Amino acid sequence: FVNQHLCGSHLVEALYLVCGERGFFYTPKT
Amino acid sequence: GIVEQCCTSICSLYQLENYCN
């Protein structure tokens, strides 16, 4: 696999693909 | 964290996998 530059909703799409049915947590800094 | 890293720099799919449930 290649490295990634992912901002905004693009990172959520990547998490979705990587994790599939496992699900995931999206946890930005506040 | 990962959300900032992937945007300001780069990140791998293996790093993203740490956020799966």
mmCIF file with all atom_site columns, N, CA and C in Angstrom:
data_model
loop_
_atom_site.group_PDB
_atom_site.id
_atom_site.type_symbol
_atom_site.label_atom_id
_atom_site.label_alt_id
_atom_site.label_comp_id
_atom_site.label_asym_id
_atom_site.label_entity_id
_atom_site.label_seq_id
_atom_site.pdbx_PDB_ins_code
_atom_site.Cartn_x
_atom_site.Cartn_y
_atom_site.Cartn_z
_atom_site.occupancy
_atom_site.B_iso_or_equiv
_atom_site.pdbx_formal_charge
_atom_site.auth_seq_id
_atom_site.auth_comp_id
_atom_site.auth_asym_id
_atom_site.auth_atom_id
_atom_site.pdbx_PDB_model_num
ATOM 1   N N  . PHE A 1 1  ? 0.828   -1.239 0.000  1.00 0.00 ? 1  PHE A N  1
ATOM 2   C CA . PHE A 1 1  ? 0.000   0.000  0.000  1.00 0.00 ? 1  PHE A CA 1
ATOM 3   C C  . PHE A 1 1  ? 0.842   1.259  0.000  1.00 0.00 ? 1  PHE A C  1
ATOM 4   N N  . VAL A 1 2  ? 0.280   2.327  -0.422 1.00 0.00 ? 2  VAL A N  1
ATOM 5   C CA . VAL A 1 2  ? 0.973   3.604  -0.496 1.00 0.00 ? 2  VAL A CA 1
ATOM 6   C C  . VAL A 1 2  ? 0.582   4.475  0.658  1.00 0.00 ? 2  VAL A C  1
ATOM 7   N N  . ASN A 1 3  ? 1.449   5.426  0.992  1.00 0.00 ? 3  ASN A N  1
ATOM 8   C CA . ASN A 1 3  ? 1.085   6.457  1.951  1.00 0.00 ? 3  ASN A CA 1
ATOM 9   C C  . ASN A 1 3  ? 0.063   7.375  1.372  1.00 0.00 ? 3  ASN A C  1
ATOM 10  N N  . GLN A 1 4  ? -0.558  8.101  2.310  1.00 0.00 ? 4  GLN A N  1
ATOM 11  C CA . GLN A 1 4  ? -1.822  8.821  2.182  1.00 0.00 ? 4  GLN A CA 1
ATOM 12  C C  . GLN A 1 4  ? -1.704  10.279 2.604  1.00 0.00 ? 4  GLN A C  1
ATOM 13  N N  . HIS A 1 5  ? -2.351  11.208 1.846  1.00 0.00 ? 5  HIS A N  1
ATOM 14  C CA . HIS A 1 5  ? -2.578  12.592 2.293  1.00 0.00 ? 5  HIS A CA 1
ATOM 15  C C  . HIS A 1 5  ? -4.065  12.758 2.257  1.00 0.00 ? 5  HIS A C  1
ATOM 16  N N  . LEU A 1 6  ? -4.683  12.798 3.454  1.00 0.00 ? 6  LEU A N  1
ATOM 17  C CA . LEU A 1 6  ? -6.144  12.730 3.614  1.00 0.00 ? 6  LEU A CA 1
ATOM 18  C C  . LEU A 1 6  ? -6.626  13.804 4.523  1.00 0.00 ? 6  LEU A C  1
ATOM 19  N N  . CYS A 1 7  ? -7.448  14.679 4.033  1.00 0.00 ? 7  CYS A N  1
ATOM 20  C CA . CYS A 1 7  ? -8.092  15.762 4.798  1.00 0.00 ? 7  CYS A CA 1
ATOM 21  C C  . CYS A 1 7  ? -9.617  15.608 4.788  1.00 0.00 ? 7  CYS A C  1
ATOM 22  N N  . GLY A 1 8  ? -10.244 16.166 5.811  1.00 0.00 ? 8  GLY A N  1
ATOM 23  C CA . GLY A 1 8  ? -11.701 16.201 5.828  1.00 0.00 ? 8  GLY A CA 1
ATOM 24  C C  . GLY A 1 8  ? -12.352 14.878 5.620  1.00 0.00 ? 8  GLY A C  1
ATOM 25  N N  . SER A 1 9  ? -13.407 14.852 4.813  1.00 0.00 ? 9  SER A N  1
ATOM 26  C CA . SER A 1 9  ? -14.182 13.651 4.603  1.00 0.00 ? 9  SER A CA 1
ATOM 27  C C  . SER A 1 9  ? -13.362 12.571 3.927  1.00 0.00 ? 9  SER A C  1
ATOM 28  N N  . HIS A 1 10 ? -12.284 12.898 3.232  1.00 0.00 ? 10 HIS A N  1
ATOM 29  C CA . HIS A 1 10 ? -11.457 11.870 2.610  1.00 0.00 ? 10 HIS A CA 1
ATOM 30  C C  . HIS A 1 10 ? -10.868 10.946 3.626  1.00 0.00 ? 10 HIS A C  1
ATOM 31  N N  . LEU A 1 11 ? -10.525 11.424 4.811  1.00 0.00 ? 11 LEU A N  1
ATOM 32  C CA . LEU A 1 11 ? -10.001 10.490 5.802  1.00 0.00 ? 11 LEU A CA 1
ATOM 33  C C  . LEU A 1 11 ? -11.084 9.556  6.322  1.00 0.00 ? 11 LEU A C  1
ATOM 34  N N  . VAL A 1 12 ? -12.320 10.024 6.481  1.00 0.00 ? 12 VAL A N  1
ATOM 35  C CA . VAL A 1 12 ? -13.392 9.122  6.868  1.00 0.00 ? 12 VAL A CA 1
ATOM 36  C C  . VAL A 1 12 ? -13.658 8.039  5.855  1.00 0.00 ? 12 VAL A C  1
ATOM 37  N N  . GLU A 1 13 ? -13.558 8.347  4.569  1.00 0.00 ? 13 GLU A N  1
ATOM 38  C CA . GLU A 1 13 ? -13.713 7.330  3.523  1.00 0.00 ? 13 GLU A CA 1
ATOM 39  C C  . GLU A 1 13 ? -12.620 6.304  3.633  1.00 0.00 ? 13 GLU A C  1
ATOM 40  N N  . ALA A 1 14 ? -11.392 6.748  3.905  1.00 0.00 ? 14 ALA A N  1
ATOM 41  C CA . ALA A 1 14 ? -10.284 5.826  4.052  1.00 0.00 ? 14 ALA A CA 1
ATOM 42  C C  . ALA A 1 14 ? -10.484 4.899  5.266  1.00 0.00 ? 14 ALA A C  1
ATOM 43  N N  . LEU A 1 15 ? -10.895 5.462  6.389  1.00 0.00 ? 15 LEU A N  1
ATOM 44  C CA . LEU A 1 15 ? -11.214 4.634  7.554  1.00 0.00 ? 15 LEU A CA 1
ATOM 45  C C  . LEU A 1 15 ? -12.277 3.600  7.244  1.00 0.00 ? 15 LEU A C  1
ATOM 46  N N  . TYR A 1 16 ? -13.320 4.038  6.531  1.00 0.00 ? 16 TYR A N  1
ATOM 47  C CA . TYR A 1 16 ? -14.386 3.106  6.171  1.00 0.00 ? 16 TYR A CA 1
ATOM 48  C C  . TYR A 1 16 ? -13.823 1.931  5.390  1.00 0.00 ? 16 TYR A C  1
ATOM 49  N N  . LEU A 1 17 ? -12.997 2.204  4.375  1.00 0.00 ? 17 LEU A N  1
ATOM 50  C CA . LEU A 1 17 ? -12.417 1.153  3.586  1.00 0.00 ? 17 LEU A CA 1
ATOM 51  C C  . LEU A 1 17 ? -11.480 0.244  4.386  1.00 0.00 ? 17 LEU A C  1
ATOM 52  N N  . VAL A 1 18 ? -10.634 0.825  5.164  1.00 0.00 ? 18 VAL A N  1
ATOM 53  C CA . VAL A 1 18 ? -9.686  0.016  5.913  1.00 0.00 ? 18 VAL A CA 1
ATOM 54  C C  . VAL A 1 18 ? -10.414 -0.893 6.892  1.00 0.00 ? 18 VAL A C  1
ATOM 55  N N  . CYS A 1 19 ? -11.409 -0.348 7.586  1.00 0.00 ? 19 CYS A N  1
ATOM 56  C CA . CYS A 1 19 ? -11.997 -1.048 8.697  1.00 0.00 ? 19 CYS A CA 1
ATOM 57  C C  . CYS A 1 19 ? -13.160 -1.926 8.388  1.00 0.00 ? 19 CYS A C  1
ATOM 58  N N  . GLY A 1 20 ? -13.891 -1.566 7.355  1.00 0.00 ? 20 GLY A N  1
ATOM 59  C CA . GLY A 1 20 ? -15.021 -2.389 6.933  1.00 0.00 ? 20 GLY A CA 1
ATOM 60  C C  . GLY A 1 20 ? -16.001 -2.617 8.081  1.00 0.00 ? 20 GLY A C  1
ATOM 61  N N  . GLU A 1 21 ? -16.407 -3.877 8.233  1.00 0.00 ? 21 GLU A N  1
ATOM 62  C CA . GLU A 1 21 ? -17.397 -4.235 9.226  1.00 0.00 ? 21 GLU A CA 1
ATOM 63  C C  . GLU A 1 21 ? -16.896 -4.113 10.657 1.00 0.00 ? 21 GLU A C  1
ATOM 64  N N  . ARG A 1 22 ? -15.599 -3.944 10.887 1.00 0.00 ? 22 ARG A N  1
ATOM 65  C CA . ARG A 1 22 ? -15.089 -3.711 12.198 1.00 0.00 ? 22 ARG A CA 1
ATOM 66  C C  . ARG A 1 22 ? -15.593 -2.393 12.698 1.00 0.00 ? 22 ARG A C  1
ATOM 67  N N  . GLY A 1 23 ? -15.923 -1.439 11.804 1.00 0.00 ? 23 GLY A N  1
ATOM 68  C CA . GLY A 1 23 ? -16.191 -0.086 12.256 1.00 0.00 ? 23 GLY A CA 1
ATOM 69  C C  . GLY A 1 23 ? -14.979 0.639  12.717 1.00 0.00 ? 23 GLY A C  1
ATOM 70  N N  . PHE A 1 24 ? -15.139 1.893  13.091 1.00 0.00 ? 24 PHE A N  1
ATOM 71  C CA . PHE A 1 24 ? -14.046 2.731  13.473 1.00 0.00 ? 24 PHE A CA 1
ATOM 72  C C  . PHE A 1 24 ? -14.517 3.898  14.286 1.00 0.00 ? 24 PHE A C  1
ATOM 73  N N  . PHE A 1 25 ? -13.508 4.583  14.888 1.00 0.00 ? 25 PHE A N  1
ATOM 74  C CA . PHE A 1 25 ? -13.705 5.825  15.596 1.00 0.00 ? 25 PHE A CA 1
ATOM 75  C C  . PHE A 1 25 ? -12.963 6.948  14.871 1.00 0.00 ? 25 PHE A C  1
ATOM 76  N N  . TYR A 1 26 ? -13.681 8.029  14.633 1.00 0.00 ? 26 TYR A N  1
ATOM 77  C CA . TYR A 1 26 ? -13.163 9.254  14.057 1.00 0.00 ? 26 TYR A CA 1
ATOM 78  C C  . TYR A 1 26 ? -12.987 10.241 15.168 1.00 0.00 ? 26 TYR A C  1
ATOM 79  N N  . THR A 1 27 ? -11.725 10.611 15.490 1.00 0.00 ? 27 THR A N  1
ATOM 80  C CA . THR A 1 27 ? -11.438 11.362 16.709 1.00 0.00 ? 27 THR A CA 1
ATOM 81  C C  . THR A 1 27 ? -10.516 12.581 16.426 1.00 0.00 ? 27 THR A C  1
ATOM 82  N N  . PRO A 1 28 ? -11.030 13.637 15.828 1.00 0.00 ? 28 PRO A N  1
ATOM 83  C CA . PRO A 1 28 ? -10.206 14.861 15.604 1.00 0.00 ? 28 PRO A CA 1
ATOM 84  C C  . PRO A 1 28 ? -9.807  15.487 16.899 1.00 0.00 ? 28 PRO A C  1
ATOM 85  N N  . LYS A 1 29 ? -8.732  16.261 16.830 1.00 0.00 ? 29 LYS A N  1
ATOM 86  C CA . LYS A 1 29 ? -8.392  17.187 17.894 1.00 0.00 ? 29 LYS A CA 1
ATOM 87  C C  . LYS A 1 29 ? -9.387  18.318 17.946 1.00 0.00 ? 29 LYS A C  1
ATOM 88  N N  . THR A 1 30 ? -9.693  18.747 19.154 1.00 0.00 ? 30 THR A N  1
ATOM 89  C CA . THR A 1 30 ? -10.583 19.890 19.344 1.00 0.00 ? 30 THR A CA 1
ATOM 90  C C  . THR A 1 30 ? -9.797  21.055 19.945 1.00 0.00 ? 30 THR A C  1
ATOM 91  N N  . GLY B 2 1  ? -3.181  14.389 16.410 1.00 0.00 ? 1  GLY B N  1
ATOM 92  C CA . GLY B 2 1  ? -3.543  12.945 16.295 1.00 0.00 ? 1  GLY B CA 1
ATOM 93  C C  . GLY B 2 1  ? -3.652  12.558 14.885 1.00 0.00 ? 1  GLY B C  1
ATOM 94  N N  . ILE B 2 2  ? -4.264  11.401 14.589 1.00 0.00 ? 2  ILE B N  1
ATOM 95  C CA . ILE B 2 2  ? -4.290  10.820 13.245 1.00 0.00 ? 2  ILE B CA 1
ATOM 96  C C  . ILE B 2 2  ? -4.983  11.684 12.292 1.00 0.00 ? 2  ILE B C  1
ATOM 97  N N  . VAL B 2 3  ? -6.034  12.387 12.708 1.00 0.00 ? 3  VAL B N  1
ATOM 98  C CA . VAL B 2 3  ? -6.797  13.210 11.766 1.00 0.00 ? 3  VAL B CA 1
ATOM 99  C C  . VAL B 2 3  ? -5.950  14.359 11.278 1.00 0.00 ? 3  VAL B C  1
ATOM 100 N N  . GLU B 2 4  ? -5.208  14.963 12.174 1.00 0.00 ? 4  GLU B N  1
ATOM 101 C CA . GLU B 2 4  ? -4.286  16.046 11.815 1.00 0.00 ? 4  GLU B CA 1
ATOM 102 C C  . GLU B 2 4  ? -3.044  15.577 11.044 1.00 0.00 ? 4  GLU B C  1
ATOM 103 N N  . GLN B 2 5  ? -2.460  14.470 11.452 1.00 0.00 ? 5  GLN B N  1
ATOM 104 C CA . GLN B 2 5  ? -1.302  13.898 10.786 1.00 0.00 ? 5  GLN B CA 1
ATOM 105 C C  . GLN B 2 5  ? -1.553  13.583 9.320  1.00 0.00 ? 5  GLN B C  1
ATOM 106 N N  . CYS B 2 6  ? -2.651  12.896 9.039  1.00 0.00 ? 6  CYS B N  1
ATOM 107 C CA . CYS B 2 6  ? -2.950  12.485 7.670  1.00 0.00 ? 6  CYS B CA 1
ATOM 108 C C  . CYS B 2 6  ? -3.162  13.731 6.765  1.00 0.00 ? 6  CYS B C  1
ATOM 109 N N  . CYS B 2 7  ? -3.612  14.845 7.353  1.00 0.00 ? 7  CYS B N  1
ATOM 110 C CA . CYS B 2 7  ? -3.879  16.055 6.580  1.00 0.00 ? 7  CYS B CA 1
ATOM 111 C C  . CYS B 2 7  ? -2.677  16.986 6.411  1.00 0.00 ? 7  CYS B C  1
ATOM 112 N N  . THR B 2 8  ? -1.942  17.191 7.487  1.00 0.00 ? 8  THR B N  1
ATOM 113 C CA . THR B 2 8  ? -0.801  18.070 7.427  1.00 0.00 ? 8  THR B CA 1
ATOM 114 C C  . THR B 2 8  ? 0.457   17.397 6.947  1.00 0.00 ? 8  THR B C  1
ATOM 115 N N  . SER B 2 9  ? 0.552   16.090 7.143  1.00 0.00 ? 9  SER B N  1
ATOM 116 C CA . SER B 2 9  ? 1.667   15.342 6.635  1.00 0.00 ? 9  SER B CA 1
ATOM 117 C C  . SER B 2 9  ? 1.179   14.188 5.770  1.00 0.00 ? 9  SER B C  1
ATOM 118 N N  . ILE B 2 10 ? 1.587   12.967 6.113  1.00 0.00 ? 10 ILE B N  1
ATOM 119 C CA . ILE B 2 10 ? 1.061   11.784 5.441  1.00 0.00 ? 10 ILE B CA 1
ATOM 120 C C  . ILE B 2 10 ? 0.813   10.723 6.494  1.00 0.00 ? 10 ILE B C  1
ATOM 121 N N  . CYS B 2 11 ? 0.006   9.719  6.155  1.00 0.00 ? 11 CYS B N  1
ATOM 122 C CA . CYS B 2 11 ? -0.216  8.581  7.019  1.00 0.00 ? 11 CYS B CA 1
ATOM 123 C C  . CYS B 2 11 ? -0.411  7.322  6.232  1.00 0.00 ? 11 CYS B C  1
ATOM 124 N N  . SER B 2 12 ? -0.217  6.164  6.832  1.00 0.00 ? 12 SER B N  1
ATOM 125 C CA . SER B 2 12 ? -0.366  4.888  6.145  1.00 0.00 ? 12 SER B CA 1
ATOM 126 C C  . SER B 2 12 ? -1.710  4.229  6.515  1.00 0.00 ? 12 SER B C  1
ATOM 127 N N  . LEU B 2 13 ? -2.109  3.290  5.685  1.00 0.00 ? 13 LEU B N  1
ATOM 128 C CA . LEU B 2 13 ? -3.296  2.495  5.966  1.00 0.00 ? 13 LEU B CA 1
ATOM 129 C C  . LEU B 2 13 ? -3.142  1.656  7.228  1.00 0.00 ? 13 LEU B C  1
ATOM 130 N N  . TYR B 2 14 ? -1.880  1.280  7.528  1.00 0.00 ? 14 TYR B N  1
ATOM 131 C CA . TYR B 2 14 ? -1.563  0.516  8.740  1.00 0.00 ? 14 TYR B CA 1
ATOM 132 C C  . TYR B 2 14 ? -1.773  1.407  9.970  1.00 0.00 ? 14 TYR B C  1
ATOM 133 N N  . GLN B 2 15 ? -1.414  2.693  9.917  1.00 0.00 ? 15 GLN B N  1
ATOM 134 C CA . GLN B 2 15 ? -1.714  3.624  10.977 1.00 0.00 ? 15 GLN B CA 1
ATOM 135 C C  . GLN B 2 15 ? -3.235  3.833  11.148 1.00 0.00 ? 15 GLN B C  1
ATOM 136 N N  . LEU B 2 16 ? -3.959  3.927  10.047 1.00 0.00 ? 16 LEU B N  1
ATOM 137 C CA . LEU B 2 16 ? -5.415  4.077  10.111 1.00 0.00 ? 16 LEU B CA 1
ATOM 138 C C  . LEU B 2 16 ? -6.074  2.881  10.761 1.00 0.00 ? 16 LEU B C  1
ATOM 139 N N  . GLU B 2 17 ? -5.518  1.711  10.580 1.00 0.00 ? 17 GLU B N  1
ATOM 140 C CA . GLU B 2 17 ? -6.095  0.504  11.124 1.00 0.00 ? 17 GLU B CA 1
ATOM 141 C C  . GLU B 2 17 ? -6.146  0.518  12.662 1.00 0.00 ? 17 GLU B C  1
ATOM 142 N N  . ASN B 2 18 ? -5.294  1.276  13.304 1.00 0.00 ? 18 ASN B N  1
ATOM 143 C CA . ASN B 2 18 ? -5.371  1.431  14.758 1.00 0.00 ? 18 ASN B CA 1
ATOM 144 C C  . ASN B 2 18 ? -6.701  2.039  15.224 1.00 0.00 ? 18 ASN B C  1
ATOM 145 N N  . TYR B 2 19 ? -7.476  2.680  14.368 1.00 0.00 ? 19 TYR B N  1
ATOM 146 C CA . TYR B 2 19 ? -8.729  3.278  14.702 1.00 0.00 ? 19 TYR B CA 1
ATOM 147 C C  . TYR B 2 19 ? -9.907  2.432  14.409 1.00 0.00 ? 19 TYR B C  1
ATOM 148 N N  . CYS B 2 20 ? -9.717  1.236  13.881 1.00 0.00 ? 20 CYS B N  1
ATOM 149 C CA . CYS B 2 20 ? -10.822 0.302  13.731 1.00 0.00 ? 20 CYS B CA 1
ATOM 150 C C  . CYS B 2 20 ? -11.286 -0.188 15.105 1.00 0.00 ? 20 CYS B C  1
ATOM 151 N N  . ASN B 2 21 ? -12.561 -0.522 15.194 1.00 0.00 ? 21 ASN B N  1
ATOM 152 C CA . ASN B 2 21 ? -13.085 -1.172 16.400 1.00 0.00 ? 21 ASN B CA 1
ATOM 153 C C  . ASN B 2 21 ? -12.937 -2.695 16.337 1.00 0.00 ? 21 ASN B C  1
#
